[PDB]
Amino acid sequence: SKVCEISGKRPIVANSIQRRGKAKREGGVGKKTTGISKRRQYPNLQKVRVRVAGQEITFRVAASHIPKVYELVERAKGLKLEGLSPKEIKKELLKLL
Template identity: 35%
Template sequence: MSRQCCVLGRRPARGHTIRRKGKPKKEGGIGTHVTAQTPRIFFSNLRQKRLFVPELGRWVSLRLSARGLKTLSKNGVYATLRKAGLLQ
């Protein structure tokens, strides 16, 4: 199973962590400098949820991001799943 939100389609994003070295100017130093950029992956906050859809009368298992779960609670389960193309 992919690391993807089934409602919003959020996937892992690539980026960098920045290493800084030195003493900040406001602490009496000459300033901090970037010494390295290490590649990393930012993962979505995914949750495995089992939701009841009253219009269908059954339970549905979904892999959602935290933002996708907020979208479901705001717009309703059935309407959001129809818009995402998960229901016919």
Template identity: 45%
Template structure:
């Protein structure tokens, strides 16, 4: 099952998390030190939704991000799905 949004094409991207060690100076420590940069993936917040399209008089099941769900609510289901090439 792919982790790609049907409307916005949001997909996982690679990034890094910086590991730090020690207590910050403002908290009474001797300062934080960077020990390593560890790779990680940032995944989109995907939901599988059944959206009622009144023009087609049927439900359409799509996997979309929560950002895309907001776009569907704002612009309408048929217009958004048609622009994305889903319908």
């Protein structure tokens, strides 16, 4: 319910538009709007836990960009990350974005 660490996708505001009536294309009088109210659309955030240089790293990422985490782990083979903290490993992965 927040922000994708890979894409930056975040909650957006969208209207909820309740409608009545038969559309004109079906031969009806037309659609009438019986209510418009704000709501939020959330990114499909999920957890992704990966091992990187012997350390466990967790990403909060939209389902759309789950493979983008694994690509980062691949490209992390050309880095020197041994002995680093997970917080420090995570910053190094995201720098490759």
